[PDB]
């Protein structure tokens, strides 16, 4: 399944910090059969969007939690255009 | 510049409805040099995420308005991983 998750409150985040966070997810994602495909961040509002594939939102969130940053919101996105 | 925008209240949206909404944006995006890259929808939560390239959030929103669906939230996402 496909998921979009959102992290809020991240104002001022740098490219280095976003890379670091994404690498932390990648380091433990395979245990849960999750793959984080893309991350996009707005340092002004402090909003990070993460697109993943995995068996469930629960699995995606367990990966994030191990990586140090559980998402504030997660939605399955079964439709795409 | 790169933008992520969010539409809420789209409970129960179908694949056909998402496809047509995306087609409507694509039909008028050129005028504003806006380029919608991908859309993802969650019919359960009623959330649509739209990733685009355009000159500004103002331009992206003018396109959405013409296509009949101004986004509830729009963020420049200058960082990606």
Residue numbers in the entry:
A (entry chain A), B (entry chain B): 2 to 82
According to the publication:
Here we showed that the 82-residue hypothetical protein SCO4226 is a nickel binding protein. Each asymmetric unit contains a dimer of SCO4226, with a buried interface area of about 1100 Å2 on each subunit.
The two subunits of the dimer are almost identical, with an RMSD of 0.14 Å for apo-SCO4226, and 0.29 Å for Ni-SCO4226. The hydrophobic core is formed by residues Met5, Trp41, Tyr50, Leu52, and Val78 from both subunits.
